[PDB]
PDB file of C-alpha atoms in Angstrom:
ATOM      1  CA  UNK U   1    -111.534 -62.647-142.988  1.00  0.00           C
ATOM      2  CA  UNK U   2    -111.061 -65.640-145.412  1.00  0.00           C
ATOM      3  CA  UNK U   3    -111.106 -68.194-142.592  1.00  0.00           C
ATOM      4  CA  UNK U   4    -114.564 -66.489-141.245  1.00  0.00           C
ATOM      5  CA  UNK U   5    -115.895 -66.386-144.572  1.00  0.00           C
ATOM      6  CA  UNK U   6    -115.385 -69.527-145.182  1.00  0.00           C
ATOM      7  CA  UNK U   7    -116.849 -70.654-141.833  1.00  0.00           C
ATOM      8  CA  UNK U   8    -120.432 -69.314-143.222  1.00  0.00           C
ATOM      9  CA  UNK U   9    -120.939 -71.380-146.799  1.00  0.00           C
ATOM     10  CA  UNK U  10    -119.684 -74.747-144.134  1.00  0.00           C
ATOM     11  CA  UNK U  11    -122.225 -74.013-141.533  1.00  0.00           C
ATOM     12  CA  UNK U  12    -124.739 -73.731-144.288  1.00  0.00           C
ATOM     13  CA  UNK U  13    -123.791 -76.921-145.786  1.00  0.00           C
ATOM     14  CA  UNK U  14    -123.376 -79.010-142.304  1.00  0.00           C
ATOM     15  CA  UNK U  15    -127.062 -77.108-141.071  1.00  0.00           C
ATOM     16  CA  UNK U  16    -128.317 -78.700-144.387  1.00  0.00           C
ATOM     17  CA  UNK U  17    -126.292 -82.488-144.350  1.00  0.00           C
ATOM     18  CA  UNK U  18    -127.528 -82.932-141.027  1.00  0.00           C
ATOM     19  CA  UNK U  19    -131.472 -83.208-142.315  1.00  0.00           C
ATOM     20  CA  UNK U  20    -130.717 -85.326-145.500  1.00  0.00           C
ATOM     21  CA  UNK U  21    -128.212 -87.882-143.100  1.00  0.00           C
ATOM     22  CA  UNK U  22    -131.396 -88.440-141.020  1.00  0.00           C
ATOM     23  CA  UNK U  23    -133.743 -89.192-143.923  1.00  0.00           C
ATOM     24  CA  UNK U  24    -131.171 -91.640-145.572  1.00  0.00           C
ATOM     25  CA  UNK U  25    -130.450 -93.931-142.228  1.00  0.00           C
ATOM     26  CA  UNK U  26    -134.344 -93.748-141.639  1.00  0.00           C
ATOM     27  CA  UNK U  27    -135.101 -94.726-145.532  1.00  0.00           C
ATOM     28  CA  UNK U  28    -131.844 -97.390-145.677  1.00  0.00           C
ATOM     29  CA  UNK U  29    -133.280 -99.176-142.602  1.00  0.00           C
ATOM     30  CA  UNK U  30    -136.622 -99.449-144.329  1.00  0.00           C
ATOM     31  CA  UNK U  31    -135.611-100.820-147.551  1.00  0.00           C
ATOM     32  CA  UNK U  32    -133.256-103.511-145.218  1.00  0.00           C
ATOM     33  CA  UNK U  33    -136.298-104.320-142.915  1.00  0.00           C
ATOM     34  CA  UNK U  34    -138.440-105.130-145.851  1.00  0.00           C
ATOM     35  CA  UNK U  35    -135.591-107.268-147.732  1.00  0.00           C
ATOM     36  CA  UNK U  36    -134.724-108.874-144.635  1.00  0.00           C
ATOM     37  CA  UNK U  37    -138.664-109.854-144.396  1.00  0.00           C
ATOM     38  CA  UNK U  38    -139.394-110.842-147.603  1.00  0.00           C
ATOM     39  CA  UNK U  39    -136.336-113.554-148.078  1.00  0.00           C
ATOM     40  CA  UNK U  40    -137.057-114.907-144.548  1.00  0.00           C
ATOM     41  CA  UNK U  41    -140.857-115.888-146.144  1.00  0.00           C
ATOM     42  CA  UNK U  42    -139.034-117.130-149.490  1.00  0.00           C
ATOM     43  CA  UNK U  43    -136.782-119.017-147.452  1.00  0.00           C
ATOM     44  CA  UNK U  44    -138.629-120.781-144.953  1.00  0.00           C
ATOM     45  CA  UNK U  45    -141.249-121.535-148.083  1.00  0.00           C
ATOM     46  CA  UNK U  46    -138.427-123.168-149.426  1.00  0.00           C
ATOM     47  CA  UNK U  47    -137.014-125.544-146.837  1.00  0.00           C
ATOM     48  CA  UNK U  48    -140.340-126.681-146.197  1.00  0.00           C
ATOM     49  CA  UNK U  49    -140.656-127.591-149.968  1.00  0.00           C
ATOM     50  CA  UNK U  50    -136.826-128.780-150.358  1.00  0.00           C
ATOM     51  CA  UNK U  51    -137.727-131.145-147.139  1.00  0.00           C
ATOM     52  CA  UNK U  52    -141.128-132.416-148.250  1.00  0.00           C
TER      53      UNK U  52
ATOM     54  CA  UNK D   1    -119.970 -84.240-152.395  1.00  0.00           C
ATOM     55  CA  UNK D   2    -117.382 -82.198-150.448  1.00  0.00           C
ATOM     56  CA  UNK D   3    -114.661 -85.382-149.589  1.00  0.00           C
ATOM     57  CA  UNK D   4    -111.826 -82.716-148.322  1.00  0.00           C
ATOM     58  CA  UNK D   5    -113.826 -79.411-147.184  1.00  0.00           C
ATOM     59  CA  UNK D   6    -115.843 -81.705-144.645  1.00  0.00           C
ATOM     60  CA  UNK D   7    -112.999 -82.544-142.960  1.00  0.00           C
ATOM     61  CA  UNK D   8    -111.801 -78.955-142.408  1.00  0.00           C
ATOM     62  CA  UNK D   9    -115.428 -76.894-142.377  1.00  0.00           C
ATOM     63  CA  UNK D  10    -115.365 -77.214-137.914  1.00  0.00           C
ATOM     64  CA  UNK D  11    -113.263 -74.164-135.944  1.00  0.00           C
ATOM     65  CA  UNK D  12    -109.644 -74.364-134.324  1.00  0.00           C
ATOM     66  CA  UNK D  13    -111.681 -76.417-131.463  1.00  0.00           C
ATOM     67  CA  UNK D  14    -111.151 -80.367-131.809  1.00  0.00           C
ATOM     68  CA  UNK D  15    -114.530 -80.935-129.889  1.00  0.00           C
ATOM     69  CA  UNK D  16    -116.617 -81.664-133.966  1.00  0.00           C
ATOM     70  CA  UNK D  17    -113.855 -84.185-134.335  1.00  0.00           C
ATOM     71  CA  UNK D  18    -116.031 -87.194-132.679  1.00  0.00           C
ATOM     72  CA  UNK D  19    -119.887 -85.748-134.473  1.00  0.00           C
ATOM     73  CA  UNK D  20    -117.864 -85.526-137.753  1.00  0.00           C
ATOM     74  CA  UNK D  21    -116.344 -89.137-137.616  1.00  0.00           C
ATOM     75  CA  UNK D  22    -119.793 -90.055-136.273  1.00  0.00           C
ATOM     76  CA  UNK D  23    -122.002 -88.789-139.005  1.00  0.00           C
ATOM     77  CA  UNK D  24    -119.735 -90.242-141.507  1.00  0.00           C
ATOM     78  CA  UNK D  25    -119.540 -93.665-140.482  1.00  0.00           C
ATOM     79  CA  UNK D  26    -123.794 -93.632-140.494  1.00  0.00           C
ATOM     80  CA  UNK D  27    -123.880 -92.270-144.161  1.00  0.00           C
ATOM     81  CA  UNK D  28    -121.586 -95.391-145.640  1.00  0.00           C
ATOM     82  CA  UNK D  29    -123.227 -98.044-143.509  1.00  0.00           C
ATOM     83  CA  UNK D  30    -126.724 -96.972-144.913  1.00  0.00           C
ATOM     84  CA  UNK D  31    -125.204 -96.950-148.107  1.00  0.00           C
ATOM     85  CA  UNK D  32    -123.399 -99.993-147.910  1.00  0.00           C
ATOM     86  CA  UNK D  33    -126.357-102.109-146.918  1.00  0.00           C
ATOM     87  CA  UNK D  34    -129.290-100.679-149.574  1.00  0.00           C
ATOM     88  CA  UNK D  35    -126.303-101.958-152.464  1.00  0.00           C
ATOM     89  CA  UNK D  36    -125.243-105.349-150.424  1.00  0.00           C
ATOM     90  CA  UNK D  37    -128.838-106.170-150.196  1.00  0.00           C
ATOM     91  CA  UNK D  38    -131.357-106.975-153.213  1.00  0.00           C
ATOM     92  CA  UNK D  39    -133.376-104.114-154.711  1.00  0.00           C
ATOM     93  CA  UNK D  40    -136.597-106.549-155.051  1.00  0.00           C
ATOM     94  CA  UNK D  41    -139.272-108.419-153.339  1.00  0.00           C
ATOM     95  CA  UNK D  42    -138.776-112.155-153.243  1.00  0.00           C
ATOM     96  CA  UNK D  43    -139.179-114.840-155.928  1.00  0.00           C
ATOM     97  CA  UNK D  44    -141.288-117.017-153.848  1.00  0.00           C
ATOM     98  CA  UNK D  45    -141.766-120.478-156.140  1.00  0.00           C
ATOM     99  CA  UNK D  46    -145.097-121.693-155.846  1.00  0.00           C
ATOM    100  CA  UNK D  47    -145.309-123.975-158.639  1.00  0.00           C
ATOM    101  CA  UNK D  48    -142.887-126.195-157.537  1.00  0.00           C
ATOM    102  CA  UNK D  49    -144.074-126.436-154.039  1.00  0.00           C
ATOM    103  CA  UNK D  50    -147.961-126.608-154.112  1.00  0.00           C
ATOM    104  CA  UNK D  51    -147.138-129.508-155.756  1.00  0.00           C
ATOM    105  CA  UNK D  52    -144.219-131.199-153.286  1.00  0.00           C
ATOM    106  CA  UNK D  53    -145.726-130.538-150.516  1.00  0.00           C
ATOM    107  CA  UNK D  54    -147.153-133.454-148.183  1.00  0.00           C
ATOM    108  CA  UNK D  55    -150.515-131.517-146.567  1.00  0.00           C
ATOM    109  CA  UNK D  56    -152.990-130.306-148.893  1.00  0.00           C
ATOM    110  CA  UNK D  57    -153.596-126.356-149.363  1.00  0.00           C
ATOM    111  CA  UNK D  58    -150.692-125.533-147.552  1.00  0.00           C
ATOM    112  CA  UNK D  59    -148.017-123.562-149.484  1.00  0.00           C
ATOM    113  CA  UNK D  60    -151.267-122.423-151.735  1.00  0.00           C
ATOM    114  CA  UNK D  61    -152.037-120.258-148.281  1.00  0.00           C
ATOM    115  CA  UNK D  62    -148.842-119.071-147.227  1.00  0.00           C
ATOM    116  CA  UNK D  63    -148.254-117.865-151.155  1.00  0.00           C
ATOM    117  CA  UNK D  64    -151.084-115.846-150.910  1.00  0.00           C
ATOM    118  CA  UNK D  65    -150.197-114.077-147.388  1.00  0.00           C
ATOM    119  CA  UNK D  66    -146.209-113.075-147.964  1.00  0.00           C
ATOM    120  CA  UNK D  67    -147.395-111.162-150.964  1.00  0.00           C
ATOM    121  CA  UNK D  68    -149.800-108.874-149.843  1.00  0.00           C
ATOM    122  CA  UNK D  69    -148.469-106.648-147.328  1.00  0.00           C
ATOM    123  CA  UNK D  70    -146.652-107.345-143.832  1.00  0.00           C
ATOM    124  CA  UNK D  71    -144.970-104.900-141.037  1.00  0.00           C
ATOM    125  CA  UNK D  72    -141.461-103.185-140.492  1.00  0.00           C
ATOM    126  CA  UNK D  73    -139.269-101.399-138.792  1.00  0.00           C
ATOM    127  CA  UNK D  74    -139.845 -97.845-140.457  1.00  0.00           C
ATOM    128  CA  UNK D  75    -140.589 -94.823-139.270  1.00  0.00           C
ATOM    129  CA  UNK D  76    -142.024 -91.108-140.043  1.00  0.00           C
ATOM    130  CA  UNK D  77    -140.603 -87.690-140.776  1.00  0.00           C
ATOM    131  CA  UNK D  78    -142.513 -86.431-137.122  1.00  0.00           C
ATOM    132  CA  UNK D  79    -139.713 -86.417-135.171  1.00  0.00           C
ATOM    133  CA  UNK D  80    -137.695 -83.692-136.704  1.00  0.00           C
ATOM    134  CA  UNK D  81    -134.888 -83.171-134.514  1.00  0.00           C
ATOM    135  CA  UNK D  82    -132.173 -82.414-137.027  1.00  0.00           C
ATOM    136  CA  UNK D  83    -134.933 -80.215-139.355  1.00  0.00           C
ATOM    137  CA  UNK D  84    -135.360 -77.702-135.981  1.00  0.00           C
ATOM    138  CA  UNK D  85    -131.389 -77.707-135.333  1.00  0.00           C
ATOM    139  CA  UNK D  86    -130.485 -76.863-138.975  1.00  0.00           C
ATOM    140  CA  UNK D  87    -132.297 -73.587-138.649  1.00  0.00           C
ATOM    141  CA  UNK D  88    -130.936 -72.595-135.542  1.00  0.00           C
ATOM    142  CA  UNK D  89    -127.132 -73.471-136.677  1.00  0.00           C
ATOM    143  CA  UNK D  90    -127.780 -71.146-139.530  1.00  0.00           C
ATOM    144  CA  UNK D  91    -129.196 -68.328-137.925  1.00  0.00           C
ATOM    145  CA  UNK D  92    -125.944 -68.644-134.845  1.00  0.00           C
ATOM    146  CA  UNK D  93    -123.081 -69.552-136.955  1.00  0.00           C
ATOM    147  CA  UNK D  94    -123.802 -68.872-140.860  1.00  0.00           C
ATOM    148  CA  UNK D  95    -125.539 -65.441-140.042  1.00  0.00           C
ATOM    149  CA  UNK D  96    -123.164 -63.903-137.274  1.00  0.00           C
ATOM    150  CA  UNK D  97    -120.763 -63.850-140.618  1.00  0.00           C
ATOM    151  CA  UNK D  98    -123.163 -61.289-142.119  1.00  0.00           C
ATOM    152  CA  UNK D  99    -122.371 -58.874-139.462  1.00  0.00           C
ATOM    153  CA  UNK D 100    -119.123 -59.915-138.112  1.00  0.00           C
ATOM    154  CA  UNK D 101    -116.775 -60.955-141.523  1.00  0.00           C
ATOM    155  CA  UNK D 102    -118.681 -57.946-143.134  1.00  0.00           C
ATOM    156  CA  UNK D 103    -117.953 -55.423-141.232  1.00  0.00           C
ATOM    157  CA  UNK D 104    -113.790 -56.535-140.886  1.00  0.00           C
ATOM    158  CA  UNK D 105    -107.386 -51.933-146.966  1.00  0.00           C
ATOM    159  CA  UNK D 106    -108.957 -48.726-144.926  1.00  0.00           C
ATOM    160  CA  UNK D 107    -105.404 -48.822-143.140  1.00  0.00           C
ATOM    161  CA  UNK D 108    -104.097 -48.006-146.478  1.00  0.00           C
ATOM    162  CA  UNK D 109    -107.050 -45.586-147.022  1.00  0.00           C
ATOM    163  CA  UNK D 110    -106.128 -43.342-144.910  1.00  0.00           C
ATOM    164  CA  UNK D 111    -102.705 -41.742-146.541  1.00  0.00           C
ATOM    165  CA  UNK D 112     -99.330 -42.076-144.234  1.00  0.00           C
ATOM    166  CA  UNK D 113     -97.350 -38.543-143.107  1.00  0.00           C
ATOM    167  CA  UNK D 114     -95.161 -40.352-141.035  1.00  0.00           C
ATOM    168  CA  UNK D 115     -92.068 -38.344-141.951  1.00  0.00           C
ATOM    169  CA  UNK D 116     -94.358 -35.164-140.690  1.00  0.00           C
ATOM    170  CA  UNK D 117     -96.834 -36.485-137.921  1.00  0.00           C
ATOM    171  CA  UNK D 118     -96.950 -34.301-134.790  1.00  0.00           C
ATOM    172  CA  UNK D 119     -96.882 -35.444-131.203  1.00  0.00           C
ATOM    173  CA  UNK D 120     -99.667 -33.153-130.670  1.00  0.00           C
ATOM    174  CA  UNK D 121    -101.582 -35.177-133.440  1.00  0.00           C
ATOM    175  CA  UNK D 122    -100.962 -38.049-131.714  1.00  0.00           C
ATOM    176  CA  UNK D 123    -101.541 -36.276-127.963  1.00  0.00           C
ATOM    177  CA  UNK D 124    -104.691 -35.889-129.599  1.00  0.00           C
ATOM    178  CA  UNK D 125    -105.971 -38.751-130.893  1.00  0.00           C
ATOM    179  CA  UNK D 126    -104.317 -40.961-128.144  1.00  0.00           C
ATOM    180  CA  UNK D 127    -104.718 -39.254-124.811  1.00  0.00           C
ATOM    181  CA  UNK D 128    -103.647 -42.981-123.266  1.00  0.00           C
ATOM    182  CA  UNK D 129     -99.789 -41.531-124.616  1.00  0.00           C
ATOM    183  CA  UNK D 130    -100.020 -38.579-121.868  1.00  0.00           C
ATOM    184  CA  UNK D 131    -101.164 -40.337-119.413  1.00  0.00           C
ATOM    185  CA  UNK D 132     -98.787 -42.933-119.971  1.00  0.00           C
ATOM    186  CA  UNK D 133     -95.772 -40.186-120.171  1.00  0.00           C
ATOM    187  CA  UNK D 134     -97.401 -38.337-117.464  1.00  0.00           C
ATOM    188  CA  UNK D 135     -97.740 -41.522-115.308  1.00  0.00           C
ATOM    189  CA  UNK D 136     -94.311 -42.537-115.868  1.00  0.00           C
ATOM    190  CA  UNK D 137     -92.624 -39.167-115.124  1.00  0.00           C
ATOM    191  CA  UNK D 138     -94.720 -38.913-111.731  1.00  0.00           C
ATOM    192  CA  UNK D 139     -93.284 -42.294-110.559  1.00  0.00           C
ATOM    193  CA  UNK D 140     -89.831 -41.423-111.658  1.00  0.00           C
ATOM    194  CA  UNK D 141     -88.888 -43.888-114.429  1.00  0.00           C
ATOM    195  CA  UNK D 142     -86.944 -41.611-117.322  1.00  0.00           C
ATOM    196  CA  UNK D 143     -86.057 -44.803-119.227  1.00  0.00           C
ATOM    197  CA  UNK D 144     -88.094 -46.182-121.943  1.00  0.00           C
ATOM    198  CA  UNK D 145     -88.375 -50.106-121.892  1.00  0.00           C
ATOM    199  CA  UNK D 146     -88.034 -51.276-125.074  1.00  0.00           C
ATOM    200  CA  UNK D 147     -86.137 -48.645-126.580  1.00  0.00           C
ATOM    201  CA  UNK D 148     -82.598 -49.252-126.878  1.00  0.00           C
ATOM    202  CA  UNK D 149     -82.766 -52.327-128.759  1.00  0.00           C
ATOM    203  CA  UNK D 150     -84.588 -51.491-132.079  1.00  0.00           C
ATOM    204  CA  UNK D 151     -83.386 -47.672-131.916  1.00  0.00           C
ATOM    205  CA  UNK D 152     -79.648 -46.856-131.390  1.00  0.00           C
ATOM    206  CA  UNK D 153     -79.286 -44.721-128.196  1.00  0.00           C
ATOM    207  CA  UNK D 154     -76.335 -42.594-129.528  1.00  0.00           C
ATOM    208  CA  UNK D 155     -75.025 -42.154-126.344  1.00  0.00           C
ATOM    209  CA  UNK D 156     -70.768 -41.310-126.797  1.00  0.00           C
ATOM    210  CA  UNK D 157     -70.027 -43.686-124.168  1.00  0.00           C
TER     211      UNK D 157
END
């Protein structure tokens, strides 16, 4: 009885994990993309400038 | 933040072992790289290289382009896959405790007159002991397996 119990509250907390774990990779990966774009610009901006 | 019940919230069935390690390895990488990276734009110096450049109006456009707007790899919250599987876990595994764990000290309920319990009373509510008795007398075997070793025989020799 305690072991089934306690089976109910963790499938209720891995149903819910499972949704949220999706959202953060998918949000992380944004955030990164964007970063990753934005220094390449500043960069390349500023080995043309350092060179010149 | 459950750190030691996620490790033990699966079965007696190692098969979660490789979607636990899985799903935990995703969560610090994503985390990992959002505080590794910088939480800003860029800083983009335009005064000092409108100015140092050799061709004329040439950093003064490219300025003007990275800071509007620009694609990347994002997505959308239409493919739902683990939104439509956390509803059916729940209703398979979190509500077959409702009816199962539920409906498992009525042993103790129900008072014990051991020292004055009738083999009729128990011919009755167990027919499976005549049968047995009656089964076992038709083939022929008069001893009891079992018996002798928890309760004495008390034969004289």
């Amino acid at each position: 009885r305690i072991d089934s119990v306690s089976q109910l509250q963790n499938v209720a907390e891995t149903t819910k994990v499972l949704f949220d774990v999706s959202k953060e990779t998918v949000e992380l990966e944004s955030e990164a993309f964007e970063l990753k774009q934005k220094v390449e610009l500043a960069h390349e901006a500023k080995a043309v400038l350092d060179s010149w | 933040l459950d750190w030691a019940k996620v490790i033990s919230s699966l079965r007696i069935t190692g098969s979660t072992a490789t979607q636990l390690s899985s799903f935990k390895k995703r969560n610090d990488e994503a985390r990992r790289q959002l505080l590794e990276l910088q939480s800003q734009p860029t800083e983009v110096d335009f005064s000092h290289y409108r100015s140092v450049l050799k061709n004329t109006s040439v950093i003064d456009k490219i300025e003007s382009y990275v800071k509007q707007y620009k694609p990347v790899k994002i997505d959308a919250s239409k493919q739902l896959q683990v939104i439509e599987s956390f509803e059916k876990h729940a209703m398979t595994n979190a509500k077959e405790t409702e009816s199962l764990v539920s409906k498992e000290l009525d042993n103790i309920q129900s008072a014990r007159p051991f020292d004055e319990l009738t083999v009729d009373d128990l011919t009755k509510i167990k027919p499976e002991i005549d049968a047995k008795v009656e089964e076992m007398v038709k083939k022929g075997k008069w001893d009891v397996p079992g018996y002798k070793d928890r309760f004495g025989n008390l034969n004289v020799m």
